[PDB]
Enzyme design. Structure first.
Site, PDB file in Angstrom:
ATOM      1  N   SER A  45       0.806  -1.213   0.000  1.00 32.43           N
ATOM      2  CA  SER A  45       0.000   0.000   0.000  1.00 32.43           C
ATOM      3  C   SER A  45       0.847   1.274   0.000  1.00 32.43           C
ATOM      4  O   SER A  45       0.276   2.362  -0.153  1.00 32.43           O
ATOM      5  CB  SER A  45      -0.966   0.000   1.195  1.00 32.43           C
ATOM      6  OG  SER A  45      -1.858  -1.115   1.182  1.00 32.43           O
ATOM      7  N   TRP A 185       1.129  -3.289   4.300  1.00 35.04           N
ATOM      8  CA  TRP A 185       1.084  -4.629   4.902  1.00 35.04           C
ATOM      9  C   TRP A 185       0.953  -5.675   3.795  1.00 35.04           C
ATOM     10  O   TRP A 185      -0.152  -5.913   3.299  1.00 35.04           O
ATOM     11  CB  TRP A 185      -0.063  -4.741   5.891  1.00 35.04           C
ATOM     12  CG  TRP A 185       0.056  -5.907   6.854  1.00 35.04           C
ATOM     13  CD1 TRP A 185       0.718  -7.098   6.654  1.00 35.04           C
ATOM     14  CD2 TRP A 185      -0.500  -5.976   8.172  1.00 35.04           C
ATOM     15  NE1 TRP A 185       0.592  -7.894   7.767  1.00 35.04           N
ATOM     16  CE2 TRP A 185      -0.142  -7.227   8.714  1.00 35.04           C
ATOM     17  CE3 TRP A 185      -1.269  -5.095   8.947  1.00 35.04           C
ATOM     18  CZ2 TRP A 185      -0.525  -7.616   9.997  1.00 35.04           C
ATOM     19  CZ3 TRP A 185      -1.649  -5.480  10.213  1.00 35.04           C
ATOM     20  CH2 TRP A 185      -1.275  -6.730  10.730  1.00 35.04           C
TER      21      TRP A 185
END
Ligand SMILES: *C(=O)[C@H]([C@@H](C)O)[C@H]1C[C@@H](SCC/N=C/N)C(C(=O)O)=N1
Length: 239
Positions: A45, A185
């Site tokens: 991300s 993550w």
């Protein structure tokens, strides 16, 4: 701000990670696995930042466009709404950024990524997943330098585009301070990698960039990276 108290914060969360800090081209490593600072991981991300920049600069979207949620089940229930490119940044809404990525297109996306020289600059062939499972990998030092150039508005994009992406990234505004950043993550590779890359706008406007990178486990709360970082920057006396 001793480099040891920070080893113990990491000793104690039972993780393996590094905190990279840049203050005007001078870089320091803190934590308990400083070798991570030169290791290539997938961005995850965090690549949303370079995706937004590339998408805005090339007018594949604008900060006012609303991305329509067309009904499909998504990985988080807060992602199940119409939202702007900015709200998708806050929520790490992967479908929005995959739609943007496919507008950009493989040719344009590889060209921009190579020009910016982000990570290994390899995006391979699937334009909508290369930041999440490779071939794109970047080291935490390389990350803090990218996010540094973005705070100083020194990236190879229009001044207004960088300002726009910068305004998508505010996280906490207390005490006359400002902390900008983007979490990450990659829960699908072994071991899992967690990111947090941003900068602190100290009250006088001095800019101090950080790339926290740690191995993750499924049971850790989201706010473990926030917790680790906020209490580390407190120790180094940056907040
Ligand atoms: C972004 O990097 C994440 C991924 C789907 O691309 C999204 C979703 C959460 S991760 C939740 C999965 N594991 C939890 N234990 C997220 C984040 O805050 O990093 N962004």
């Amino acid at each position: 701000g001793h480099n040891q108290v920070i080893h113990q914060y990491f000793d104690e969360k039972n993780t393996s990670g590094v905190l990279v800090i840049q203050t005007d081209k001078k870089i320091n490593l803190y934590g308990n696995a400083l070798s991570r600072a030169n290791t290539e991981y997938v961005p995850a991300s965090t690549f949303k930042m370079l995706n937004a920049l590339i998408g805005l600069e090339n007018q594949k979207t604008d900060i006012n466009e609303i991305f329509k949620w067309k009904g499909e089940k998504r990985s988080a229930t807060a992602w199940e709404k119409d939202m702007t490119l900015g709200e998708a940044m806050k929520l790490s809404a992967v479908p929005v950024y995959q739609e943007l990525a496919r507008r950009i297109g493989l040719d344009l996306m590889q060209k921009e990524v190579k020009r910016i020289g982000f990570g290994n600059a390899e995006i391979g062939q699937q334009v909508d997943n290369f930041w999440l499972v490779g071939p794109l990998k970047v080291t935490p030092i390389q990350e803090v330098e990218f996010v540094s150039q973005l705070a100083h508005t020194q990236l190879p994009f229009s001044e207004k585009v960088q300002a726009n992406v910068k305004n998508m990234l505010l996280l906490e505004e207390s005490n006359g301070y400002k902390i900008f950043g983007k979490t990450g993550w990659a829960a699908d590779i072994k071991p899992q990698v967690g990111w947090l890359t941003g900068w602190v706008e100290q009250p006088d406007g001095k800019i101090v960039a950080f790339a926290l990178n740690m191995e993750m486990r499924s049971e850790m709360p989201a706010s473990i990276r926030n917790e680790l970082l906020m209490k580390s920057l407190k120790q180094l006396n940056i907040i």
